[PDB]
Amino acid sequence: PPGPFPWPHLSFARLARRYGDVFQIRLGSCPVVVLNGERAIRQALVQQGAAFAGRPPFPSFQVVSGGRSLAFGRYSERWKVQRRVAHSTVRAFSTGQPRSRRVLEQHVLGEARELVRLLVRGSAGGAFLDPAPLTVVAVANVMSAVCFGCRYSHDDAEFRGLLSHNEKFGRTVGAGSLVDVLPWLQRFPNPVRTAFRDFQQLNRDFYSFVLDKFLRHRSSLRPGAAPRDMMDAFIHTVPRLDLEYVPATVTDIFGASQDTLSTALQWLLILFTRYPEVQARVQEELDRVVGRDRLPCMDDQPHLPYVMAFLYEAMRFSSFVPVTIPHATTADTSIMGYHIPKDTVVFVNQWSVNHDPVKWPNPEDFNPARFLDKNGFINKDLASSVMIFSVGKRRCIGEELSKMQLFLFISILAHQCNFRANPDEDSKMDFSYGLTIKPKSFTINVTLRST
Ligand code: HEM
Numbered sequence: 001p002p003g004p005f006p007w008p009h010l011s012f013a014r015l016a017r018r019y020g021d022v023f024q025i026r027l028g029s030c031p032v033v034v035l036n037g038e039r040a041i042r043q044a045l046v047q048q049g050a051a052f053a054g055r056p057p058f059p060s061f062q063v064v065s066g067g068r069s070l071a072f073g074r075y076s077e078r079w080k081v082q083r084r085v086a087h088s089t090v091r092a093f094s095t096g097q098p099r100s101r102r103v104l105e106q107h108v109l110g111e112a113r114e115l116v117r118l119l120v121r122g123s124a125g126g127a128f129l130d131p132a133p134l135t136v137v138a139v140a141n142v143m144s145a146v147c148f149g150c151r152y153s154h155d156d157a158e159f160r161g162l163l164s165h166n167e168k169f170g171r172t173v174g175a176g177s178l179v180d181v182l183p184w185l186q187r188f189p190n191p192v193r194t195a196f197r198d199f200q201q202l203n204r205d206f207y208s209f210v211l212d213k214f215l216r217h218r219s220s221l222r223p224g225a226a227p228r229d230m231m232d233a234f235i236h237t238v239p240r241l242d243l244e245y246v247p248a249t250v251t252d253i254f255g256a257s258q259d260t261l262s263t264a265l266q267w268l269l270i271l272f273t274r275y276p277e278v279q280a281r282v283q284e285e286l287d288r289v290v291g292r293d294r295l296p297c298m299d300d301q302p303h304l305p306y307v308m309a310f311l312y313e314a315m316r317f318s319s320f321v322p323v324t325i326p327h328a329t330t331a332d333t334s335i336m337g338y339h340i341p342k343d344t345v346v347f348v349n350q351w352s353v354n355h356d357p358v359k360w361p362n363p364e365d366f367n368p369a370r371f372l373d374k375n376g377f378i379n380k381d382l383a384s385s386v387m388i389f390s391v392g393k394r395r396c397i398g399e400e401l402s403k404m405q406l407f408l409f410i411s412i413l414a415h416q417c418n419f420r421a422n423p424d425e426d427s428k429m430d431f432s433y434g435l436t437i438k439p440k441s442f443t444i445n446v447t448l449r450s451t
Pocket residue numbers: 070071072083090252253254256257260261264321323324325326348388389390391393394395396397398399401402
Protein backbone atom coordinates (compact mmCIF):
# COMPACT_ATOMS: atom_id res chain seq x y z
CA PRO A 1 0.00 0.00 0.00
CA PRO A 2 1.30 3.50 -0.84
CA GLY A 3 3.35 4.72 2.10
CA PRO A 4 1.73 6.68 4.95
CA PHE A 5 0.92 10.15 3.77
CA PRO A 6 0.80 13.14 6.13
CA TRP A 7 -2.14 15.50 6.19
CA PRO A 8 -11.86 16.58 5.66
CA HIS A 9 -13.25 13.49 3.93
CA LEU A 10 -12.55 15.40 0.70
CA SER A 11 -8.82 15.11 1.37
CA PHE A 12 -9.19 11.34 0.92
CA ALA A 13 -10.56 11.84 -2.60
CA ARG A 14 -7.65 14.18 -3.38
CA LEU A 15 -5.07 11.47 -2.69
CA ALA A 16 -7.08 8.76 -4.47
CA ARG A 17 -6.96 10.68 -7.76
CA ARG A 18 -3.15 10.61 -7.44
CA TYR A 19 -1.86 7.73 -5.29
CA GLY A 20 -4.53 5.15 -6.19
CA ASP A 21 -7.85 3.90 -4.88
CA VAL A 22 -6.11 2.39 -1.83
CA PHE A 23 -3.45 4.00 0.36
CA GLN A 24 -2.25 4.49 3.93
CA ILE A 25 -2.48 7.48 6.25
CA ARG A 26 -0.88 8.16 9.62
CA LEU A 27 -3.43 9.11 12.30
CA GLY A 28 -1.03 10.17 15.03
CA SER A 29 0.01 6.83 16.51
CA CYS A 30 -2.15 4.37 14.56
CA PRO A 31 -1.65 3.77 10.81
CA VAL A 32 -4.87 3.46 8.84
CA VAL A 33 -5.90 2.24 5.37
CA VAL A 34 -8.44 4.05 3.19
CA LEU A 35 -10.74 2.54 0.55
CA ASN A 36 -12.17 5.08 -1.91
CA GLY A 37 -13.42 3.34 -5.05
CA GLU A 38 -16.57 1.30 -5.37
CA ARG A 39 -14.16 -1.36 -6.65
CA ALA A 40 -11.85 -1.19 -3.62
CA ILE A 41 -14.81 -1.15 -1.22
CA ARG A 42 -17.09 -3.76 -2.78
CA GLN A 43 -14.00 -5.96 -3.04
CA ALA A 44 -13.03 -5.49 0.61
CA LEU A 45 -16.48 -5.39 2.24
CA VAL A 46 -18.64 -7.67 0.05
CA GLN A 47 -16.29 -10.18 -1.58
CA GLN A 48 -13.84 -10.28 1.35
CA GLY A 49 -16.45 -9.12 3.87
CA ALA A 50 -15.57 -11.64 6.58
CA ALA A 51 -12.01 -10.26 6.43
CA PHE A 52 -12.98 -6.59 6.95
CA ALA A 53 -15.80 -7.17 9.47
CA GLY A 54 -13.71 -6.10 12.48
CA ARG A 55 -13.61 -2.99 14.64
CA PRO A 56 -10.56 -1.32 16.21
CA PRO A 57 -10.14 -1.71 19.98
CA PHE A 58 -10.83 1.87 21.11
CA PRO A 59 -11.61 3.67 24.39
CA SER A 60 -14.67 5.31 22.82
CA PHE A 61 -16.16 1.97 21.82
CA GLN A 62 -16.59 -0.13 24.95
CA VAL A 63 -18.35 2.20 27.41
CA VAL A 64 -21.21 2.45 24.90
CA SER A 65 -24.03 0.01 25.71
CA GLY A 66 -21.97 -1.38 28.58
CA GLY A 67 -19.21 -3.03 26.58
CA ARG A 68 -21.78 -5.00 24.57
CA SER A 69 -22.34 -2.62 21.66
CA LEU A 70 -23.19 -4.07 18.27
CA ALA A 71 -21.85 -1.04 16.39
CA PHE A 72 -18.48 -1.07 18.19
CA GLY A 73 -18.06 -4.72 19.16
CA ARG A 74 -15.16 -6.75 17.84
CA TYR A 75 -15.76 -9.44 15.22
CA SER A 76 -16.41 -12.53 17.35
CA GLU A 77 -18.43 -15.74 17.21
CA ARG A 78 -20.93 -14.29 19.69
CA TRP A 79 -21.00 -10.96 17.83
CA LYS A 80 -22.15 -12.77 14.68
CA VAL A 81 -25.09 -14.02 16.75
CA GLN A 82 -25.79 -10.52 18.07
CA ARG A 83 -26.13 -9.19 14.51
CA ARG A 84 -28.22 -12.04 13.11
CA VAL A 85 -30.95 -11.50 15.70
CA ALA A 86 -30.48 -7.72 15.60
CA HIS A 87 -30.88 -7.63 11.82
CA SER A 88 -33.78 -10.09 11.91
CA THR A 89 -35.62 -8.30 14.73
CA VAL A 90 -35.32 -4.81 13.23
CA ARG A 91 -36.27 -6.17 9.82
CA ALA A 92 -39.34 -7.66 11.50
CA PHE A 93 -40.58 -4.26 12.65
CA SER A 94 -39.93 -2.20 9.52
CA THR A 95 -41.41 -4.75 7.11
CA GLY A 96 -43.13 -8.05 7.75
CA GLN A 97 -45.17 -7.64 10.91
CA PRO A 98 -48.16 -5.92 9.26
CA ARG A 99 -48.83 -4.74 12.80
CA SER A 100 -45.36 -3.28 13.35
CA ARG A 101 -45.64 -1.41 10.06
CA ARG A 102 -48.90 0.01 11.40
CA VAL A 103 -47.56 0.63 14.91
CA LEU A 104 -44.56 2.33 13.29
CA GLU A 105 -46.59 4.18 10.66
CA GLN A 106 -48.80 5.55 13.44
CA HIS A 107 -45.80 6.92 15.35
CA VAL A 108 -44.36 8.52 12.20
CA LEU A 109 -47.69 10.11 11.26
CA GLY A 110 -48.24 11.53 14.74
CA GLU A 111 -44.83 13.17 15.00
CA ALA A 112 -44.93 14.23 11.34
CA ARG A 113 -48.15 16.18 11.91
CA GLU A 114 -46.63 17.68 15.05
CA LEU A 115 -43.78 18.78 12.77
CA VAL A 116 -45.91 20.68 10.24
CA ARG A 117 -47.74 22.20 13.22
CA LEU A 118 -44.60 23.62 14.85
CA LEU A 119 -43.12 24.47 11.44
CA VAL A 120 -46.13 26.44 10.19
CA ARG A 121 -46.85 28.19 13.49
CA GLY A 122 -43.19 29.18 13.69
CA SER A 123 -43.51 30.71 10.20
CA ALA A 124 -46.70 32.69 10.81
CA GLY A 125 -47.06 35.66 8.50
CA GLY A 126 -43.66 35.86 6.84
CA ALA A 127 -41.45 34.64 9.66
CA PHE A 128 -38.48 32.33 9.15
CA LEU A 129 -37.10 29.76 11.58
CA ASP A 130 -34.32 27.20 11.89
CA PRO A 131 -35.72 23.66 11.41
CA ALA A 132 -32.70 21.87 12.91
CA PRO A 133 -34.00 21.68 16.52
CA LEU A 134 -37.40 20.46 15.27
CA THR A 135 -35.92 17.64 13.18
CA VAL A 136 -33.87 16.35 16.12
CA VAL A 137 -36.98 16.48 18.31
CA ALA A 138 -39.11 14.59 15.78
CA VAL A 139 -36.40 11.95 15.38
CA ALA A 140 -35.85 11.50 19.12
CA ASN A 141 -39.58 11.20 19.84
CA VAL A 142 -40.28 8.69 17.06
CA MET A 143 -37.38 6.41 18.00
CA SER A 144 -38.49 6.53 21.63
CA ALA A 145 -41.86 5.17 20.47
CA VAL A 146 -40.05 2.44 18.52
CA CYS A 147 -37.74 1.45 21.39
CA PHE A 148 -39.97 2.13 24.42
CA GLY A 149 -43.46 2.40 22.89
CA CYS A 150 -44.32 5.63 24.70
CA ARG A 151 -44.22 8.57 22.28
CA TYR A 152 -43.64 11.29 24.87
CA SER A 153 -45.14 14.77 24.73
CA HIS A 154 -42.54 17.38 23.80
CA ASP A 155 -42.77 18.93 27.29
CA ASP A 156 -42.49 15.66 29.24
CA ALA A 157 -39.61 15.85 31.71
CA GLU A 158 -38.21 12.40 30.90
CA PHE A 159 -38.28 13.29 27.20
CA ARG A 160 -36.37 16.49 27.96
CA GLY A 161 -33.58 14.31 29.34
CA LEU A 162 -33.30 12.27 26.15
CA LEU A 163 -32.94 15.46 24.12
CA SER A 164 -30.36 16.66 26.65
CA HIS A 165 -28.58 13.31 26.34
CA ASN A 166 -28.23 13.43 22.55
CA GLU A 167 -26.75 16.95 22.68
CA LYS A 168 -23.95 16.26 25.18
CA PHE A 169 -23.38 12.97 23.36
CA GLY A 170 -22.72 14.60 19.99
CA ARG A 171 -20.73 17.36 21.71
CA THR A 172 -18.33 15.01 23.55
CA VAL A 173 -17.99 12.17 21.03
CA GLY A 174 -15.23 14.32 19.54
CA ALA A 175 -13.21 13.97 22.73
CA GLY A 176 -13.99 10.26 22.89
CA SER A 177 -12.52 9.91 19.40
CA LEU A 178 -9.45 12.03 20.15
CA VAL A 179 -8.40 9.52 22.81
CA ASP A 180 -8.65 6.80 20.14
CA VAL A 181 -5.92 8.54 18.13
CA LEU A 182 -4.15 10.24 21.08
CA PRO A 183 -4.35 7.70 23.92
CA TRP A 184 -1.60 9.48 25.86
CA LEU A 185 -3.96 12.43 26.40
CA GLN A 186 -5.31 10.41 29.34
CA ARG A 187 -1.88 10.37 31.02
CA PHE A 188 -2.33 13.99 32.19
CA PRO A 189 -5.17 16.44 32.89
CA ASN A 190 -6.60 18.44 30.00
CA PRO A 191 -9.99 19.51 28.57
CA VAL A 192 -10.23 16.58 26.13
CA ARG A 193 -9.81 14.07 28.96
CA THR A 194 -12.30 15.94 31.16
CA ALA A 195 -14.72 15.69 28.23
CA PHE A 196 -13.93 12.03 27.51
CA ARG A 197 -15.05 11.25 31.06
CA ASP A 198 -18.30 13.15 30.49
CA PHE A 199 -18.77 11.03 27.37
CA GLN A 200 -18.14 7.74 29.17
CA GLN A 201 -20.42 8.69 32.07
CA LEU A 202 -23.11 9.59 29.53
CA ASN A 203 -23.25 6.10 28.02
CA ARG A 204 -23.39 4.68 31.55
CA ASP A 205 -26.16 7.00 32.73
CA PHE A 206 -28.03 6.26 29.50
CA TYR A 207 -27.46 2.50 29.51
CA SER A 208 -28.96 2.37 33.00
CA PHE A 209 -31.89 4.40 31.66
CA VAL A 210 -32.40 1.72 29.01
CA LEU A 211 -31.69 -1.16 31.40
CA ASP A 212 -34.56 0.16 33.53
CA LYS A 213 -36.97 0.26 30.59
CA PHE A 214 -35.93 -3.34 29.88
CA LEU A 215 -36.64 -4.60 33.40
CA ARG A 216 -39.93 -2.72 33.74
CA HIS A 217 -40.82 -4.08 30.30
CA ARG A 218 -39.78 -7.65 31.06
CA SER A 219 -41.85 -7.92 34.26
CA SER A 220 -44.93 -6.64 32.46
CA LEU A 221 -47.79 -8.30 30.53
CA ARG A 222 -45.88 -11.43 29.54
CA PRO A 223 -48.31 -13.62 27.59
CA GLY A 224 -46.31 -12.89 24.45
CA ALA A 225 -49.46 -11.55 22.81
CA ALA A 226 -47.79 -8.80 20.79
CA PRO A 227 -44.57 -6.78 20.86
CA ARG A 228 -45.53 -3.25 21.84
CA ASP A 229 -42.23 -1.92 20.50
CA MET A 230 -38.66 -2.87 19.62
CA MET A 231 -37.87 -3.87 23.21
CA ASP A 232 -40.35 -6.76 23.37
CA ALA A 233 -39.39 -8.07 19.92
CA PHE A 234 -35.82 -8.41 21.19
CA ILE A 235 -37.00 -10.20 24.34
CA HIS A 236 -39.22 -12.53 22.31
CA THR A 237 -36.22 -13.43 20.12
CA VAL A 238 -34.20 -14.61 23.14
CA PRO A 239 -23.12 -19.57 21.04
CA ARG A 240 -25.41 -18.16 23.75
CA LEU A 241 -26.21 -14.51 24.42
CA ASP A 242 -26.29 -13.13 27.94
CA LEU A 243 -29.74 -11.76 28.70
CA GLU A 244 -27.98 -8.41 29.21
CA TYR A 245 -27.51 -8.23 25.42
CA VAL A 246 -31.15 -7.28 24.74
CA PRO A 247 -30.83 -3.81 26.34
CA ALA A 248 -27.31 -3.41 24.93
CA THR A 249 -28.54 -3.56 21.33
CA VAL A 250 -31.49 -1.25 22.03
CA THR A 251 -29.06 1.38 23.34
CA ASP A 252 -27.36 1.21 19.93
CA ILE A 253 -30.58 1.14 17.89
CA PHE A 254 -31.52 4.40 19.61
CA GLY A 255 -28.17 6.19 19.47
CA ALA A 256 -27.69 5.19 15.84
CA SER A 257 -30.98 6.52 14.47
CA GLN A 258 -30.54 9.95 16.08
CA ASP A 259 -27.82 12.04 14.44
CA THR A 260 -28.36 10.49 10.99
CA LEU A 261 -32.14 10.74 10.63
CA SER A 262 -31.94 14.32 11.93
CA THR A 263 -29.32 15.30 9.36
CA ALA A 264 -31.32 13.33 6.79
CA LEU A 265 -34.37 15.54 7.34
CA GLN A 266 -32.23 18.69 7.51
CA TRP A 267 -30.98 17.91 3.99
CA LEU A 268 -34.40 16.91 2.65
CA LEU A 269 -35.69 20.30 3.85
CA ILE A 270 -32.91 22.64 2.73
CA LEU A 271 -33.09 20.86 -0.64
CA PHE A 272 -36.82 21.56 -1.06
CA THR A 273 -35.98 25.26 -0.69
CA ARG A 274 -32.92 25.45 -2.96
CA TYR A 275 -34.67 23.51 -5.77
CA PRO A 276 -38.31 24.63 -6.05
CA GLU A 277 -38.83 22.94 -9.43
CA VAL A 278 -38.23 19.47 -7.99
CA GLN A 279 -40.30 20.34 -4.92
CA ALA A 280 -43.20 21.06 -7.27
CA ARG A 281 -42.73 17.80 -9.18
CA VAL A 282 -42.70 16.06 -5.80
CA GLN A 283 -45.82 18.01 -4.82
CA GLU A 284 -47.63 17.20 -8.07
CA GLU A 285 -46.95 13.47 -7.77
CA LEU A 286 -48.56 13.25 -4.32
CA ASP A 287 -51.82 14.99 -5.27
CA ARG A 288 -52.14 12.85 -8.41
CA VAL A 289 -51.83 9.43 -6.74
CA VAL A 290 -52.80 10.00 -3.09
CA GLY A 291 -55.35 12.80 -3.27
CA ARG A 292 -56.13 15.74 -1.02
CA ASP A 293 -58.56 14.13 1.45
CA ARG A 294 -56.06 11.79 3.14
CA LEU A 295 -52.38 11.72 4.06
CA PRO A 296 -49.74 9.57 2.33
CA CYS A 297 -49.01 6.10 3.66
CA MET A 298 -46.42 3.42 2.93
CA ASP A 299 -48.84 1.51 0.69
CA ASP A 300 -48.34 4.38 -1.79
CA GLN A 301 -44.54 4.12 -1.87
CA PRO A 302 -44.59 1.86 -4.97
CA HIS A 303 -46.96 4.32 -6.68
CA LEU A 304 -44.63 7.23 -5.78
CA PRO A 305 -41.58 6.82 -8.03
CA TYR A 306 -40.40 10.43 -7.87
CA VAL A 307 -40.74 10.87 -4.10
CA MET A 308 -38.20 8.10 -3.51
CA ALA A 309 -36.03 9.27 -6.40
CA PHE A 310 -35.85 12.59 -4.55
CA LEU A 311 -34.89 10.63 -1.43
CA TYR A 312 -32.21 8.44 -3.02
CA GLU A 313 -30.56 11.39 -4.77
CA ALA A 314 -30.72 13.56 -1.64
CA MET A 315 -28.69 10.86 0.10
CA ARG A 316 -26.25 10.68 -2.83
CA PHE A 317 -25.75 14.44 -3.13
CA SER A 318 -25.26 15.11 0.58
CA SER A 319 -23.55 11.85 1.54
CA PHE A 320 -24.05 13.11 5.09
CA VAL A 321 -22.30 9.92 6.23
CA PRO A 322 -19.06 10.47 4.27
CA VAL A 323 -16.96 7.89 6.15
CA THR A 324 -18.45 4.85 7.86
CA ILE A 325 -17.41 3.56 11.28
CA PRO A 326 -13.72 2.54 11.02
CA HIS A 327 -13.25 -1.12 10.16
CA ALA A 328 -10.48 -3.51 11.21
CA THR A 329 -9.19 -6.56 9.38
CA THR A 330 -10.03 -9.97 10.83
CA ALA A 331 -7.01 -11.62 9.18
CA ASP A 332 -4.31 -10.98 6.59
CA THR A 333 -5.63 -10.23 3.12
CA SER A 334 -4.77 -8.56 -0.17
CA ILE A 335 -6.74 -5.98 -2.16
CA MET A 336 -5.76 -4.48 -5.54
CA GLY A 337 -2.43 -6.29 -5.24
CA TYR A 338 -1.49 -4.86 -1.83
CA HIS A 339 -0.79 -6.76 1.38
CA ILE A 340 -2.95 -5.94 4.40
CA PRO A 341 -1.86 -7.16 7.87
CA LYS A 342 -4.35 -8.06 10.58
CA ASP A 343 -5.71 -5.66 13.21
CA THR A 344 -5.16 -2.69 10.88
CA VAL A 345 -7.59 0.22 10.94
CA VAL A 346 -9.33 0.85 7.62
CA PHE A 347 -11.74 3.65 6.70
CA VAL A 348 -14.46 3.41 4.05
CA ASN A 349 -15.13 6.56 1.99
CA GLN A 350 -18.77 6.45 0.93
CA TRP A 351 -18.44 9.98 -0.47
CA SER A 352 -16.12 8.74 -3.22
CA VAL A 353 -18.71 6.22 -4.44
CA ASN A 354 -21.46 8.84 -4.70
CA HIS A 355 -19.37 11.44 -6.57
CA ASP A 356 -17.22 9.33 -8.90
CA PRO A 357 -17.82 11.12 -12.24
CA VAL A 358 -17.91 7.84 -14.20
CA LYS A 359 -20.77 6.49 -12.09
CA TRP A 360 -22.66 9.75 -11.61
CA PRO A 361 -21.98 11.84 -14.74
CA ASN A 362 -22.49 15.28 -13.19
CA PRO A 363 -21.54 14.62 -9.54
CA GLU A 364 -22.12 17.99 -7.83
CA ASP A 365 -25.46 18.58 -9.61
CA PHE A 366 -28.73 17.78 -7.82
CA ASN A 367 -31.03 15.93 -10.24
CA PRO A 368 -33.40 13.28 -8.83
CA ALA A 369 -34.27 12.16 -12.38
CA ARG A 370 -31.18 9.92 -12.32
CA PHE A 371 -33.04 7.11 -10.56
CA LEU A 372 -36.08 7.70 -12.80
CA ASP A 373 -35.17 6.24 -16.20
CA LYS A 374 -37.92 7.53 -18.45
CA ASN A 375 -38.03 4.55 -20.83
CA GLY A 376 -40.05 2.84 -18.11
CA PHE A 377 -40.96 6.17 -16.46
CA ILE A 378 -40.96 4.24 -13.16
CA ASN A 379 -38.34 4.17 -10.42
CA LYS A 380 -35.11 2.48 -11.50
CA ASP A 381 -33.22 0.17 -9.13
CA LEU A 382 -29.86 1.96 -9.37
CA ALA A 383 -30.52 3.29 -5.84
CA SER A 384 -28.98 0.07 -4.51
CA SER A 385 -25.61 1.46 -5.66
CA VAL A 386 -25.90 4.62 -3.54
CA MET A 387 -23.35 4.28 -0.72
CA ILE A 388 -24.65 5.73 2.54
CA PHE A 389 -25.76 2.63 4.47
CA SER A 390 -22.43 0.93 3.67
CA VAL A 391 -22.05 -2.65 2.40
CA GLY A 392 -20.96 -6.07 3.60
CA LYS A 393 -21.26 -7.51 7.09
CA ARG A 394 -21.31 -4.20 9.00
CA ARG A 395 -23.91 -2.48 6.80
CA CYS A 396 -26.65 -0.55 8.58
CA ILE A 397 -29.35 -2.80 10.02
CA GLY A 398 -31.80 0.11 9.91
CA GLU A 399 -31.58 0.75 6.18
CA GLU A 400 -35.05 -0.51 5.28
CA LEU A 401 -36.32 1.20 8.46
CA SER A 402 -35.03 4.73 7.85
CA LYS A 403 -36.13 4.57 4.20
CA MET A 404 -39.79 4.13 5.16
CA GLN A 405 -39.42 6.64 8.00
CA LEU A 406 -37.90 9.31 5.76
CA PHE A 407 -40.30 8.48 2.92
CA LEU A 408 -43.27 9.07 5.23
CA PHE A 409 -41.77 12.32 6.52
CA ILE A 410 -41.10 14.22 3.30
CA SER A 411 -44.26 12.76 1.74
CA ILE A 412 -46.31 14.21 4.60
CA LEU A 413 -44.21 17.38 4.73
CA ALA A 414 -44.65 17.95 0.98
CA HIS A 415 -48.31 16.86 0.83
CA GLN A 416 -49.31 19.61 3.29
CA CYS A 417 -46.84 22.52 3.20
CA ASN A 418 -44.85 24.72 0.84
CA PHE A 419 -41.20 25.23 1.77
CA ARG A 420 -39.58 28.52 0.77
CA ALA A 421 -35.95 29.49 1.24
CA ASN A 422 -34.83 32.72 2.86
CA PRO A 423 -33.83 35.29 0.21
CA ASP A 424 -31.12 36.81 2.45
CA GLU A 425 -29.15 33.60 3.12
CA ASP A 426 -26.96 33.82 -0.01
CA SER A 427 -28.20 30.41 -1.21
CA LYS A 428 -25.17 28.12 -1.53
CA MET A 429 -25.74 25.21 0.86
CA ASP A 430 -22.74 25.51 3.20
CA PHE A 431 -21.75 22.37 5.08
CA SER A 432 -20.84 21.73 8.71
CA TYR A 433 -18.42 18.82 9.00
CA GLY A 434 -17.71 16.23 11.65
CA LEU A 435 -20.07 13.29 12.71
CA THR A 436 -22.23 13.60 9.61
CA ILE A 437 -22.39 16.52 7.15
CA LYS A 438 -25.14 18.77 8.49
CA PRO A 439 -26.13 21.84 6.45
CA LYS A 440 -24.87 24.82 8.41
CA SER A 441 -27.54 26.91 10.15
CA PHE A 442 -30.32 27.99 7.79
CA THR A 443 -33.92 29.14 8.01
CA ILE A 444 -37.07 28.34 6.04
CA ASN A 445 -40.69 29.49 5.81
CA VAL A 446 -43.30 26.72 5.90
CA THR A 447 -46.84 27.50 4.78
CA LEU A 448 -49.82 25.32 3.94
CA ARG A 449 -50.77 24.65 0.32
CA SER A 450 -53.95 24.10 -1.68
CA THR A 451 -55.19 22.24 -4.74
C1 HEM B 1 -30.25 7.84 7.29
C2 HEM B 1 -30.25 6.85 8.19
C3 HEM B 1 -28.97 6.06 8.56
C4 HEM B 1 -27.76 6.09 7.98
C5 HEM B 1 -27.32 6.92 6.75
C6 HEM B 1 -26.89 5.18 8.71
C7 HEM B 1 -25.56 4.92 8.42
C8 HEM B 1 -24.81 3.91 8.99
C9 HEM B 1 -23.39 3.68 8.80
C10 HEM B 1 -22.45 4.52 7.92
C11 HEM B 1 -23.04 2.61 9.52
C12 HEM B 1 -21.63 1.99 9.62
C13 HEM B 1 -21.47 0.99 8.48
C14 HEM B 1 -20.08 0.41 8.49
O1 HEM B 1 -19.41 0.45 9.55
O2 HEM B 1 -19.64 -0.08 7.42
C15 HEM B 1 -24.22 2.12 10.20
C16 HEM B 1 -24.27 1.03 11.04
C17 HEM B 1 -25.24 0.79 11.98
N1 HEM B 1 -26.48 1.39 12.01
FE1 HEM B 1 -26.98 3.10 11.02
N2 HEM B 1 -27.61 4.62 9.74
C18 HEM B 1 -28.89 5.14 9.68
C19 HEM B 1 -29.93 4.83 10.54
C20 HEM B 1 -29.94 3.80 11.45
C21 HEM B 1 -31.10 3.23 12.10
C22 HEM B 1 -32.55 3.72 11.89
C23 HEM B 1 -30.68 2.25 12.92
C24 HEM B 1 -31.51 1.32 13.83
C25 HEM B 1 -32.82 1.14 13.62
C26 HEM B 1 -29.24 2.15 12.80
C27 HEM B 1 -28.44 1.26 13.47
C28 HEM B 1 -27.17 0.90 13.10
C29 HEM B 1 -26.31 -0.05 13.78
C30 HEM B 1 -26.67 -0.84 15.05
C31 HEM B 1 -25.16 -0.11 13.10
C32 HEM B 1 -23.94 -0.98 13.44
C33 HEM B 1 -23.96 -2.21 12.54
C34 HEM B 1 -22.69 -2.99 12.74
O3 HEM B 1 -21.72 -2.42 13.30
O4 HEM B 1 -22.67 -4.18 12.33
N3 HEM B 1 -28.82 3.11 11.90
N4 HEM B 1 -25.28 2.94 9.86
